[PDB]
């Protein structure tokens, strides 16, 4: 809700497809479709493991840690995030997934990161804070 630039969220982690060359992956619909085909092929699971992670969103970008806060898995730097998309898994339980498309410093390779939120409300809050971050650093 209106209006913050720094927030933490309890989420689940579906998985990642790291270091893609290109596949010609344009826009949010190609992204969702790609993740669908990965799930169908068994590269990503339909159901995430039970363990919860802490996602911190701020003007640095997105940080993912263990629920104990002890270990940092990843720092997704704001500069290297291309797109985040929130969408319904489409399965029955009506779960909301977040997909992040990130790139590397030289903009030569792409990676996809998929998370599961506990509600649609939470997924939208994460997107709001991320958007606000972008607009904030854009000044």
């Amino acid at each position: 809700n209106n209006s913050d630039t720094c927030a933490e969220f309890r989420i689940k982690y579906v998985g990642a497809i790291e270091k893609l060359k290109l596949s010609g992956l344009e826009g949010p619909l190609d992204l969702i479709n790609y993740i669908d085909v990965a799930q169908q092929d068994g590269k990503l699971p339909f159901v995430p493991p039970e363990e919860e992670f802490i996602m911190g969103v701020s003007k640095y970008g997105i940080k993912v840690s263990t629920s104990d806060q002890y270990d940092v898995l990843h720092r997704h730097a704001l500069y290297l995030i291309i797109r985040m998309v929130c969408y319904d898994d489409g399965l029955g339980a009506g779960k909301s997934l977040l997909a992040l498309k990130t790139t590397d410093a030289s903009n030569e390779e792409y990676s996809l990161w998929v998370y599961q939120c506990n509600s649609l409300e939470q997924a939208q809050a994460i997107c709001k804070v991320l958007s606000t971050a972008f607009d904030s650093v854009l000044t």
Binding site: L29, I32, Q39, Q40, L130
Partner: protein, 120 residues
Amino acid sequence: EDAYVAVIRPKSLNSREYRAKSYEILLLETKLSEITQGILDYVVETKRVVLMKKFPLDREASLFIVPSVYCLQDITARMLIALDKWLDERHAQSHFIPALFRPSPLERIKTNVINPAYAT
């Protein structure tokens, strides 16, 4: 290059058991960049496109599946029995068949956030 398509719809779906009578079938053929846009344009003219298997001929022909919303229980020869087998297994995987028949990305997208640093 060579392609084949098997179109299937249910009458279930979340069901534990695979009942071939719960599903119906319409195989088409087309030659060859865009594969996902390709087959889907061809179907409507006459949900997704799923590559299942390739079949050697002794040079290989591909079999795609197109989920949608002639009964399979009542029922090219190499491909039908392969589809019956493939469905028998995957129906005992959970979420698999529901995922096969789920709505399009556009029916499911909720939020789209882009980084202004990558504009134009």
